[PDB]
Amino acid sequence: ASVTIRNAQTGRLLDSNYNGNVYTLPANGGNYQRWTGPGDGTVRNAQTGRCLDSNYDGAVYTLPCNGGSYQKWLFYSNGYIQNVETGRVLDSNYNGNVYTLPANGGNYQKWYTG
Numbered sequence: 192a193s194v195t196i197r198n199a200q201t202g203r204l205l206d207s208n209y210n211g212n213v214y215t216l217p218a219n220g221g222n223y224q225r226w227t228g229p230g231d232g233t234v235r236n237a238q239t240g241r242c243l244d245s246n247y248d249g250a251v252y253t254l255p256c257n258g259g260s261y262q263k264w265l266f267y268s269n270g271y272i273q274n275v276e277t278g279r280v281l282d283s284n285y286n287g288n289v290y291t292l293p294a295n296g297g298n299y300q301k302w303y304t305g
C-alpha cells in the first residue's frame with residue numbers, strides 16, 4: 192500500500208532523500224516520490240523508509256520512525272494533511288520548498304493522495 196502525494200497548486204510531488212530533506216519535485220516515477228502508511232498515522236518514504244516529520248516552527252523533514260506524535264498525520268478528504276502534534280498543515284511552494292503552516296484555505300495546502 193503506497194501513494195503519491197501531489198500538490199494541488201503546483202503539481203509537484205512530495206519527495207525526500209536519505210539526508211532527511213523533504214521537498215517537492217515534478218513527477219519522475221521514482222520511489223522517493225512514493226509514500227506508505229502502515230495505519231499508525233505515519234507517512235513513510237517508500238525508498239528510504241524514513242517518516243515524514245515536522246515541528247512547531249514549521250520545518251519538515253524525515254527521520255527514522257520514532258513513535259512520536261510529530262510523525263503522525265491526518266489526511267482529510269478536502270486535501271489537508273495535518274500534523275497530529277502541532278495541528279499545522281503540510282504546505283509547499285513553487286520552488287519546491289516544504290513546510291507546515293496553520294491552515295489558510297489556500298491551494299498550496301491541498302494535496303491529492305493516492
Ligand SMILES: OC[C@H]1O[C@H](O[C@H]2[C@@H](O)[C@H](O)[C@@H](CO)O[C@@H]2O)[C@@H](O)[C@@H](O)[C@@H]1O
Binds near residue numbers: 216220
Ligand atoms: O537517480 C537517483 C534518482 O533520481 C530521480 O529522483 C530524484 C528525486 O525524486 C529524489 O528525491 C532524489 C533522491 O536523492 O534524487 C533525484 O533528485 C529519479 O529518477 C529516481 O527514480 C532516482 O532513483
Ligand SMILES: OC[C@H]1O[C@H](O[C@H]2[C@@H](O)[C@H](O)[C@@H](CO)O[C@@H]2O)[C@@H](O)[C@@H](O)[C@@H]1O
Binds near residue numbers: 244262
Ligand atoms: O525532543 C523530544 C521529541 O523527540 C522525538 O521527536 C523528534 C522529532 O521526531 C520531532 O519532529 C522533533 C520536534 O521538535 O523533536 C525530535 O527531534 C520523539 O521522541 C518525540 O516523541 C519527542 O517529543
Ligand SMILES: OC[C@H]1O[C@H](O[C@H]2[C@@H](O)[C@H](O)[C@@H](CO)O[C@@H]2O)[C@@H](O)[C@@H](O)[C@@H]1O
Binds near residue numbers: 282283284285299
Ligand atoms: O498570497 C500568497 C498565498 O498566501 C497564502 O499561502 C501561503 C502559503 O500557504 C503558501 O505555501 C505560500 C506559497 O508561496 O504562500 C503563502 O506563504 C495563501 O493565501 C495562498 O492562497 C496565497 O496564494
